[PDB]
Amino acid sequence: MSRQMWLDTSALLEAISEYVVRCNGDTFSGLTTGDFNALSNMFTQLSVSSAGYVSDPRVPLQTMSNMFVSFITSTDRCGYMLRKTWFNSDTKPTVSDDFITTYIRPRLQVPMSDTVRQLNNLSLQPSAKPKLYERQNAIMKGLDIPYSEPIEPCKLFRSVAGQTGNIPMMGILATPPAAQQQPFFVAERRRILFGIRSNAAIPAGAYQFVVPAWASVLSVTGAYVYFTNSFFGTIIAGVTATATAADAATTFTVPTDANNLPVQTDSRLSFSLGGGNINLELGVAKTGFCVAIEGEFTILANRSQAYYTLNSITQTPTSIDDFDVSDFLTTFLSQLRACGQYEIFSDAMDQLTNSLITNYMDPPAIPAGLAFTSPWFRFSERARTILALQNVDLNIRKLIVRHLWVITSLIAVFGRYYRPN
């Protein structure tokens, strides 16, 4: 039912998984560890009740997934959750299907749960690699994400007026320069890069860099800022990494700190790219330079919405990540291939995707020009394509993407135990 009901259940399943990994090889003979007890009780709540005793946890989990696939593949059944209103409301739909009456239903505790959540965003050491749940909440209800949760900046990257790619810029940063070019702002897995490259020298002085939309929400701690000539391992041409023992200290400054931030020092920096533009004061002329900020990157408190709401999207077409769904689908895919359905499933998904796209544009017809260049499980790409439709209003594409993601995520969670035979 409720979009909420599905999440509460997805969360439960993710919890079951968690406690399974917690119990692996910790299930000893003479004791009932708390973790196991909890795992046991979670199994108990998964089924109906009229599902009786659980002698072998593999079965109820297996049964549940099987019913889920025969559901998520039949338009006639799972149609209800594909219409616009399912995503934007907590309206209990009038739909009868014994999969939902059995498995989907409010599972989380209120209001205690919501509260524990809020308290976590203020917690010291959040989970480094969080559950789909959190992402689901963000992408759908646009809730907040933990203040200390780290993320790889390159994911956040989106297309801007100037450079239209983070990776593509690579082939160009490696081509020697014709003359002094425009600044560039790129990101890796563990560091941010910005600078100016020229075939001629560049005088000492003050140079302004306009922090890109997508990056204006980044924050870094334990960072080292230095000059470098590589980008993802590929060599950058048209820049100098040279310096004299007694060169003129090169410093930069951000609108959030009144003190200058040093460059090329063994000091660990803390600053945020929010608030404006980085004012960089180059100590000694250089023939093209590249600054590197390498440290722990986090999304500025309370601004994760930009990323997950798909608001940081200005132009079309655009670059876009998958919010990591691929990393979670792995198992379900393996299970699909292992019983020969990877194909029959892949078909039913196009069907699901198409019908979803449909219910978003009035009048009800697959927009022309729509042709996917990838399969349902390569979201990153399909998203790009959805977002590239000139026909439909931008804000509607944005919704479609978000919606598809939630459904996709839901799959990655519920299907894992599929075994029809």
Binding site: T32, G34, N37, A38, S40
Partner: protein, 45 residues
């Protein structure tokens, strides 16, 4: 003790006041008086 409890806990949702179940309800059709009867006509052409 904590977990011994967590094992032994379950739900029962119960209406506060018991349903009032009517058994001997007598609902039977009664014909109205004499009346003009129209004999529906047969499907013609």
């Amino acid at each position: 003790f904590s977990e011994l409890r967590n094992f032994f806990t379950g739900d029962v949702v119960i209406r506060d006041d018991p349903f009032d179940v009517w058994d001997g309800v007598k609902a039977t059709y009664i014909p109205i008086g004499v009346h003009g009867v129209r004999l529906d006509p047969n499907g013609d052409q």
